Amino acid sequence: SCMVKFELSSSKWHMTSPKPHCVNTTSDGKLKILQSGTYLIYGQVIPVDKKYIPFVVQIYKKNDVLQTLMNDFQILPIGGVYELHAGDNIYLKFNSKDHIQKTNTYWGIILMPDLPFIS
Amino acid sequence: SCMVKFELSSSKWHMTSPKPHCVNTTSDGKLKILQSGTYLIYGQVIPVDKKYIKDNAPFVVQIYKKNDVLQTLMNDFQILPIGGVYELHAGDNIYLKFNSKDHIQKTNTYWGIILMPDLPFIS
C-alpha cells in the first residue's frame, strides 16, 4: 500500500510510510518508480489569476512526454492510469513557473490494487 | 482497500472486491459514498476531435457531489484528466455531467474513486 503526494507550497511529500516501497521521492518534486506495476498518477495544477500573468503542463516519464495539458488558465487535474516499470522517473514540466499558484498545487502517485471484479 | 473504475465503453465497473465497502456503484456510472473519508476521484474523458464537431458548443465536464458542483473542467477538445483529492462523507453521491454526450468518445473514457490511505509521514 503505497501513495505519495507532493505539496508545491512546502515542497514536501506526504507519504504512507517513511520509505514507501514502491517509489523514491526527491525534494524537487520528482519521483522514481521502484516497483513495476499499475499506477494512478494524479494532481491538480492551479494557475494564478490571469490579472497577474499559454498555461501548459506536461508529465514526463524519463526523457519522453507522457502527457501534455493546456487550458486557458483554469484548474488542471492531471494524470490517469499508467503501466510503469521499476526504473522510470516521473516528473512535471511547466510552460512558466510564474503561472503556477503554489498554494493548493500538488501531484503524486498511488500503486493500484488489482481490480478483478466486475459490476 | 477500496477502488472502483467505470469504463464508459462497456458500462461496467471494475472493482477491488465483489462488494466494495466504501461505495455502491450504479450501472450508469454513478457512485454513492458509504464511508466518510479522503478520496481520490480520477478519470480521463476523451473528446471527439474538434474537427468533427460542427458547432460551437464548448467541451465541458463537471463532477457533482449531491447537488454541489465539485469541479468544472473545459479545454479545446483534448484528452481531459479529471478529479483530485476530496473529503467525501457517507451518503454523498458522485457523478459526472457532460455539456454534450456527443462530444464524448466512449472508448478509453473512464472514471472512478479510490479511498485513500492516511499519509502521515512527511519528507
Give yes or no for A29 touching B (CB within 8 A).
Answer: no
Class of A1-119 per CATH?
Answer: mainly beta
User: Biggest alpha carbon distance in chain A?
Assistant: 49
Instruction: Please state, in angstroms and rounded to a whole number, the distance separating the CA atoms of residues A52 and B90.
Output: 39
Q: How far is CA A84 from CA A80, A107, B53, B111, in A?
A: 12, 16, 34, 19
Contact A46, B71 (CB under 8 A): no
Instruction: Please state, in angstroms and rounded to a whole number, the distance separating the CA atoms of residues A43 and B41.
Output: 10
* Chain A residue with the nearest C-alpha to that of B79: A69
Using the beta-carbon criterion (under 8 Å), do B14 and A110 form an inter-chain contact? Answer: no
- For A50, the 3-state DSSP assignment is helix
All three cell numbers of A66, joined, read 507522457
All three cell numbers of B59, joined, read 467541451
Q: How far is CA A44 from CA A35, A63, A78, B83, in A?
A: 24, 22, 6, 8
All three cell numbers of A48, joined, read 494564478
Contact B4, B15 (CB under 8 A): yes
- Method used to determine the 3D structure: X-ray
CATH for the B1-123 domain, from 3.40.50.970, 2.60.120.40, 2.60.120.470, 3.40.190.170 = 2.60.120.40
- For B67, the 3-state DSSP assignment is coil
Q: What resolution (Å)?
A: 1.8
Contact B92, B34 (CB under 8 A): no
Cβ-Cβ pairs closer than 8 A, A with B, add up to 103
Neighbour-count burial of A63, counting CB atoms closer than 10 A to its CB (0-12 exposed, 13-18 middle, 19+ buried):
exposed
First to last CA, chain B: 24
Domain boundaries, given as residue ranges, for chain A: 1-119
All three cell numbers of A54, joined, read 499559454
* Chain B residue with the nearest C-alpha to that of A4: B119
